[PDB]
């Protein structure tokens, strides 16, 4: 067979960052070369494993987690980096093995008048430990006055809506991001290259 990268890259729907979509890929043959030589990807940055050296070296199972961020926020998808997205929405561990493929999607994910489908978390009381998602939409308490769950003074909505337009700045165009992550366990190497 072949590893099913078609329905994760060319998919028609990408999830927001506060609910980044996770897909477990295993028990297939890897063809990462097509990923590297496509030349349609704006950014393709790989840590731990060299892009030309991952074709032969293989693992047990990979996780492809995809989302949509701003253009200027794609620098934050990297180990040991700060910011709103890298702290409250998607944080990678310092010991990272997978890597990031981000390509512009201004002709798909941006619509004139404001594409408000994509959201990102802005406020929360604690930082994110690596590789997990929080979906809870409870109004957090900014001050010392309890808001009793209802929204009001000193208690803000954690989520904020992206406004994506085709005429935004090149640093604000909606970038579709996929992240590959590899793990080592006692399981045999199911996914390997040709």
């Amino acid at each position, epitope marked *: 067979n072949l590893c099913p990268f078609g329905e994760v890259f060319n998919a028609t729907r990408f999830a927001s960052v506060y609910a980044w979509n996770r897909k477990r890929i295993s028990n297939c043959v890897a063809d990462y070369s097509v990923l590297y030589n496509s030349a349609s990807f704006s950014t393709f940055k790989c840590y731990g494993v060299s892009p030309t050296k991952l074709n032969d070296l293989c693992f047990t199972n990979v996780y492809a987690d995809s989302f949509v961020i701003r253009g200027d926020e794609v620098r934050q998808i990297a180990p040991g980096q700060t910011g709103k997205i890298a702290d409250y929405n998607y944080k990678l561990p310092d010991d990272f093995t997978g890597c990031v493929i981000a390509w512009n999607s201004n*002709n798909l994910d941006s619509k*004139v*008048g404001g594409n408000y489908n994509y959201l990102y978390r802005l406020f929360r009381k604690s930082n994110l430990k690596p590789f997990e998602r929080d979906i809870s939409t409870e109004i957090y308490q900014a001050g010392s006055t309890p808001c009793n769950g209802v929204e009001g003074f000193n208690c803000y909505f954690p989520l904020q809506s992206y406004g994506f*337009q*085709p*005429t*935004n700045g*090149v640093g*604000y165009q909606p970038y579709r991001v996929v992240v590959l992550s590899f793990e080592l366990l006692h399981a045999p190497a199911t996914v390997c290259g040709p």
Partner: antibody
Amino acid sequence: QVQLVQSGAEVKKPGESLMISCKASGYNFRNYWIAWVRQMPGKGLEWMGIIHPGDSDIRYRPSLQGHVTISADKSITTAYLQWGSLKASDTAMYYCTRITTDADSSGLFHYWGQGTLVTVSS
Amino acid sequence: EIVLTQSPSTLSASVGDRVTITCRASQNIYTWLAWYQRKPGKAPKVLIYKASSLESGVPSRFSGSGSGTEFTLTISSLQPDDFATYYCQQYKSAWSFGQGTKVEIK
């Protein structure tokens, strides 16, 4: 200096085919959005569509999705507006504007062409 | 869809007078308002962008102020070249213009 020059005014019969051009010079035609704005008599300014040469990305308003067609020819660096079939309500003043792009914004109509009156009558 | 209003629609003063033009928004536009000057039968020219920034080449008499939903255009000293019509165009969501304000001599 950025210069946009359009054609002269047209007077056409309804149902005909009309193509109105706008020539852009003074900048790189392949890296700046150009938008078409229509000002019907008795109404305020109102955009119709945008086109970005280089990506061939053309977007119209929801109301005018299938009535007008925007096109570009980067060899001569002109932007074309064509009607499949002119109607009686298409009489207006048509502008071509080069959008200066600003972050977290819809872009700014910065430089304007001289405009071109189009009149439809029998 | 965002609709904007200008007050007053018509306003006339003499040379050197102080002219204040108010543009009001239906919803919140932050500061994404640009002010244009349009001569009769001529393409409009941008005067203010980001609601407070002067464009290169425009005389410093024009000034922009305000934020949120209340915006103000102020002309420090009216002069013969200032006589034209003005549009306040927002670009936060989709480009939309006001009804315009026409000024003339008194």
